[PDB]
Design a protein around this ligand. Structure first.
Ligand SMILES: C[S@+](CC[C@H](N)C(=O)[O-])C[C@H]1O[C@@H](n2cnc3c(N)ncnc32)[C@H](O)[C@@H]1O
Ligand SMILES: C[S@+](CC[C@H](N)C(=O)[O-])C[C@H]1O[C@@H](n2cnc3c(N)ncnc32)[C@H](O)[C@@H]1O
Ligand SMILES: [Mg+2]
Ligand SMILES: [Mg+2]
Lengths: 364, 364
């Protein structure tokens, strides 16, 4: 009856992570409520079979479960952001936006109306409380699944009401815990790609919302290489792609020019156009109150699947400058830059533009 | 017709990684042959539907495909190792053994009888050739999927005949490449866990081969906590487990004693029994010719899903000593220790035992 006085609302997606998150919290004696969000209307439906799994699991462990719909909020705060990024020639990170605006804003206020003390999710991340009571976010110990990158926008006030029960676990353990508990989701494979596109063709999906305007593909010396399918189908640094058959060696996307509808391509993983020495970022947000203007010597991640690297960051309110210790490959406008201090995730922003020798890279 | 003179035999498992590995090599003009290994007899069969995918993909890209059976070799060189580890109270890494003895020995010699110049696999790793022509292994750029850890045992002579076409790719890209090529495996989810156990219950699997002898579960101060199911069902550091319901806080496995059939358990992620300051390792193997006796200041990984950490290693032929810069949690006998020099994977061994203050940890 210690933890039984603490109500935790757990986001239950129907996956093995959230199923295990719920089981662990129940086992620790918390007052646990499972909640399924339907945030996307995808009918031939996807949400229907996942809700079945939420129900089967919630019943297996004996917790209440409910179902809430945030289609509107998700559309307005995530999907419009997603589309507007593409219109601007950038590459969005809808998950960052989703955590910031949905999982820890809409869902958190919702959970509070259920008398929740905390929300929990199956994110691979940790929260540590200070002596002072200040909460810090730490990388998940599973350094392949560590989701702090996507949680970079969370505020002190959100982290105060958050729990991450999987934070000290590695993915295979989560599956072992599920199997030993006999949870029906134990063997359920995780959905890949963005939630709302699911297992549908990406080009087809996006073209339902944005007009694709094929344009010209060029090498850096100006030689026309054919037609691309629309710039929003390519990202800085990508190997091959729609109509990139272009020598046997592969071609990469090495720049973009939205204003001429041009895709720049070139050979070599380390193509000189792919290298940067600094960036600017917007929407820079920290996990705690920071000064108006300050310098930081830390590490950063520019993409989810890379190790972090040394960085000087100069913050000045509306814009942030990031200087790389070492040249960086394929720094992508729209993606998240996330700052670390060893195991602590300090916060992050969205990349506006890359620079090499005091001149904006033609990335777009 | 440049690369068309180079024959590459690609290991095709039926998964999206190997499918894409084959497509990329074909696209680059290599003389490509896809080969499926059946190494485990698992009938109600698993191999049957995967071979269908190999065939569908090989036909989609227009390469020849064949099928070879190494059940014997796999049993003898991997599965017996796996079982013998458990009998000895250790935790095996069958993948390390499998790459060393099967994918790059049995399969490589096989491929050579097909006039192969190289074997390729869909491992997330890189090989770089020196000025001198010496090959080094580099981490995959996808730092979550990077498989150098499992490839730590590969010799210079194996790496000379190896290609890793996915080495410069991240997993989501591999899926985008697959989808754009219209490969039937594009949406196919990767199988989790060890190959031969697949989606069957682990406890059930292992008990078909090893007698489980339940024994006593004890805290570090000697208090009997109940019966465990058999020591081979638990690993150093694991949270909960079979019969670990044991306060609301979770219990961890903090040691083992095979000689008394005892499982030691304790509360707290950082339980003092979980911390080590050094280890010894056997089967230490490097990617290049090394001296008989030498010191190395580098980093190491003690488990697949952790970042590497600073380490002094003293090598002396039969045994290797590893001294941690910082105390290490749940150092597990039988697991791989793998050494790095920045992005280079130097080699590795199998952990024999952990030490704290010149005394072997009771891990077993
Ligand atoms: C799998 S998502 C993480 C993927 C991505 N990196 C991100 O941050 O969105 C992590 C957690 O969010 C919560 N979640 C995701 N979808 C949900 C849904 N439809 N309803 C309730 N919770 C959900 C679950 O607790 C889940 O374990
Ligand atoms: C998915 S396995 C990697 C998993 C594990 N970390 C390891 O090293 O074994 C990597 C590659 O091995 C090859 N491979 C695995 N199973 C195979 C099979 N049955 N037949 C042929 N190749 C296989 C494929 O090329 C595959 O992409
Ligand atoms: Mg989940
Ligand atoms: Mg594969």
């Amino acid at each position: 009856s210690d933890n039984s006085k603490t109500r935790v609302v757990v986001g239950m997606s129907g996956g093995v992570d959230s199923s295990v998150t719920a089981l662990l919290l129940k086992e620790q004696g918390y007052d646990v409520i499972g909640i399924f969000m339907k945030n996307w209307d995808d009918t031939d439906c996807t949400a229907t079979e996942d809700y079945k799994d939420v129900v089967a699991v919630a019943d297996q462990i004996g917790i209440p479960y409910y179902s809430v719909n945030f289609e509107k909020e998700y559309w307005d705060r995530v999907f419009e952001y997603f589309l507007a990024e593409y219109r601007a020639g950038r590459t969005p990170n809808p998950d960052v936006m989703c955590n910031k605006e949905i999982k820890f804003k809409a869902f958190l206020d919702y959970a509070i109306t259920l008398g929740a003390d905390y929300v929990a999710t199956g994110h691979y991340a940790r929260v540590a409380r200070d002596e002072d009571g200040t909460v810090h976010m730490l990388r998940g110990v599973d350094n392949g699944k560590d989701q702090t990158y996507f949680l970079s926008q969370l505020s002190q006030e959100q982290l105060q009401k958050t729990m991450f029960p999987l934070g000290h676990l590695e993915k295979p353990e989560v599956r072992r815990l599920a199997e030993e508990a006999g949870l029906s989701t134990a063997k359920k494979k995780d959905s890949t790609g963005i939630c709302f596109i699911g297992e549908k063709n990406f080009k087809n999906f996006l073209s339902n919302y944005l007009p694709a305007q094929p344009g010209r593909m060029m090498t850096v010396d100006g030689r026309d290489m054919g037609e691309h399918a629309g710039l929003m189908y390519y990202t800085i640094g990508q190997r091959g792609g729609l109509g990139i058959g272009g020598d046997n060696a592969p071609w990469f996307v090495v720049g973009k020019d939205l204003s001429k509808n041009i895709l720049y391509v070139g050979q070599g993983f380390y193509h000189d156009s792919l290298m940067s020495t600094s960036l600017e970022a917007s929407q820079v947000h920290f996990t705690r109150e920071m000064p108006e203007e300050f310098t930081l010597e830390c590490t950063a991640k520019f993409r989810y699947r890379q190790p972090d690297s040394k960085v000087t960051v100069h913050v000045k309110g509306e814009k942030t400058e990031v200087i790389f210790a070492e040249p960086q490959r394929a720094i992508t406008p729209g993606q998240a830059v996330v700052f670390y201090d060893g195991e602590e995730c300090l916060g992050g922003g969205l990349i506006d533009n890359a620079y090499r020798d005091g001149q904006v890279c033609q990335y777009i």
